[PDB]
Amino acid sequence: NQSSLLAEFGDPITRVENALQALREGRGVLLLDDEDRENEGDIIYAVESLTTAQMALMIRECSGIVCLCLTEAQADRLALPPMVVAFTVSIEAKHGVTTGVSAQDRVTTIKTAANPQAKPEDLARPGHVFPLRARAGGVLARRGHTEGTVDLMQMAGLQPAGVLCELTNPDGSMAKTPEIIEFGKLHNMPVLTIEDMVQYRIQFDLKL
Amino acid sequence: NQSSLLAEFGDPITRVENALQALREGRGVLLLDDEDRENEGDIIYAVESLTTAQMALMIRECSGIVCLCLTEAQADRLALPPMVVAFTVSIEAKHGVTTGVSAQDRVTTIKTAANPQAKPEDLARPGHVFPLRARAGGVLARRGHTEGTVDLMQMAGLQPAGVLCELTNPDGSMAKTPEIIEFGKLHNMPVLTIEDMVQYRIQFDLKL
Numbered sequence: 001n002q003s004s005l006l007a008e009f010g011d012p013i014t015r016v017e018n019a020l021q022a023l024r025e026g027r028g029v030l031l032l033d034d035e036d037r038e039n040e041g042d043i044i045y046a047v048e049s050l051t052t053a054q055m056a057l058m059i060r061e062c063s064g065i066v067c068l069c070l071t072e073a074q075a076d077r078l079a080l081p082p083m084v085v086a087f088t089v090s091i092e093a094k095h096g097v098t099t100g101v102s103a104q105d106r107v108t109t110i111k112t113a114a115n116p117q118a119k120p121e122d123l124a125r126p127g128h129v130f131p132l133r134a135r136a137g138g139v140l141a142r143r144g145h146t147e148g149t150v151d152l153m154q155m156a157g158l159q160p161a162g163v164l165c166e167l168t169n170p171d172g173s174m175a176k177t178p179e180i181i182e183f184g185k186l187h188n189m190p191v192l193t194i195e196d197m198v199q200y201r202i203q204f205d206l207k208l
Numbered sequence: 209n210q211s212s213l214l215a216e217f218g219d220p221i222t223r224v225e226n227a228l229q230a231l232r233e234g235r236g237v238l239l240l241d242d243e244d245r246e247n248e249g250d251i252i253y254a255v256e257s258l259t260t261a262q263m264a265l266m267i268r269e270c271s272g273i274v275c276l277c278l279t280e281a282q283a284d285r286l287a288l289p290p291m292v293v294a295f296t297v298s299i300e301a302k303h304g305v306t307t308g309v310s311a312q313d314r315v316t317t318i319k320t321a322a323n324p325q326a327k328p329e330d331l332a333r334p335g336h337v338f339p340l341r342a343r344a345g346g347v348l349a350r351r352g353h354t355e356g357t358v359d360l361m362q363m364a365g366l367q368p369a370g371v372l373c374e375l376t377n378p379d380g381s382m383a384k385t386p387e388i389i390e391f392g393k394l395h396n397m398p399v400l401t402i403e404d405m406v407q408y409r410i411q412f413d414l415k416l
């Protein structure tokens with residue numbers, strides 16, 4: 001079962017603690033959601049430590065639809081409305097980029113958007129970076145990779161902005177627990193679940 | 209120079225004719241835009257012949273932001289407004305898909321959207337497929353990969369719906385003419401330019 005497969009990453013509390021330390025070290029983590037939800041694994045990176053190499057791995061090994069998980073406050077600061085009456089309108093840096101799709105341009109757009117001093121005019125719309133508004137309460141309100149990203153950053157003591165993308169197998173199928181475990185071992189990325197995070201937050205009265 | 213590098217693909221007319229035949233054979237082509245525009249190469253496939261394997265190659269070797277090039281008429285049939293007051297709101301098949309990111313789900317969404325008998329209720333919004341409205345006149349009106357895709361399909365006698373994505377190098381940089389030429393040789397894909405198509409259409413009074 002999933003718990004048996006992830007037991008080599010440790011018990012749920014150790015899986016959360018190892019992931020938080022990986023992010024504090026500027027490294028990525030793999031977050032699995034519920035098996036009855038998407039049963040999908042996402043590469044997660046802190047924006048504060050984001051590099052062109054990390055973005056290039058995400059584009060090469062994931063869907064290529066790299067999402068920028070922001071707080072509702074940061075999304076409001078950037079005047080980002082929902083795309084349709086939690087994908088917001090897509091975004092590009094107004095300055096510092098060319099076509100916007102290059103790993104470097106996506107990082108330039110992500111850093112511009114996550115800047116706590118950012119202004120809406122810093123971002124042109126539409127673009128090739130997809131911001132997602134995290135629900136207030138995080139995984140304790142909505143059990144999605146969007147909320148897991150903000151909560152991982154807040155619990156690691158980092159800026160509440162992270163990038164996520166769905167790990168995709170070479171044949172186009174979406175990675176399932178065994179493929180995610182192998183990818184994490186190969187790329188030294190800790191693997192954890194939203195369930196691990198929810199129980200960690202409830203046990204450590206972790207209001208964020 | 210670019211013309212010298214593409215001379216091995218033939219003269220401009222042969223580059224267009226070989227690309228059209230590749231599409232009639234259900235194979236993909238690589239379209240370069242102007243070097244003073246994006247200087248980017250896109251993998252192009254007809255939707256009529258689209259396979260999960262072709263979609264998986266596109267996701268693995270391109271940006272992962274796979275766009276569905278539609279006529280303004282097909283976009284109006286699907287009630288697709290521009291994303292911001294030519295990216296439309298993103299789309300997912302309402303039926304036949306799970307999370308929408310899998311190569312198979314993206315093809316299911318693309319075939320549902322390009323169906324000449326499609327109705328807006330067939331597509332949920334937002335999603336992981338990005339439709340683009342082609343300008344009336346195609347490359348003779350706008351010199352973009354969006355217009356090159358519709359024109360390639362119409363000139364090949366195929367349904368006017370195609371998928372495009374920007375060829376991306378493993379390091380996250382965007383492929384330039386030499387990398388595009390090598391990728392085309394390796395994957396048996398003809399390489400051509402918007403300039404080749406514009407001159408072909410003007411010389412053969414090709415109103416579409």
Ligand SMILES: CC(=O)[C@@](O)(COP(=O)(O)O)C(O)O
Pocket residue numbers: 033038042067144145146147164165166307
């Ligand atoms: C990009 C994703 O990861 C989604 O998984 C969106 O994120 P959520 O898990 O719903 O928060 C995708 O399924 O659209």
Ligand SMILES: CC(=O)[C@@](O)(COP(=O)(O)O)C(O)O
Pocket residue numbers: 099241246250275352353354355372373374
């Ligand atoms: C996906 C692309 O290819 C764009 O190139 C959009 O297509 P256009 O070439 O502008 O028609 C990208 O640059 O947003």
Ligand SMILES: [Mn+2]
Pocket residue numbers: 033038040042144145146
């Ligand atoms: Mn998800």
Ligand SMILES: [Mn+2]
Pocket residue numbers: 241246248250352353354
């Ligand atoms: Mn283009």
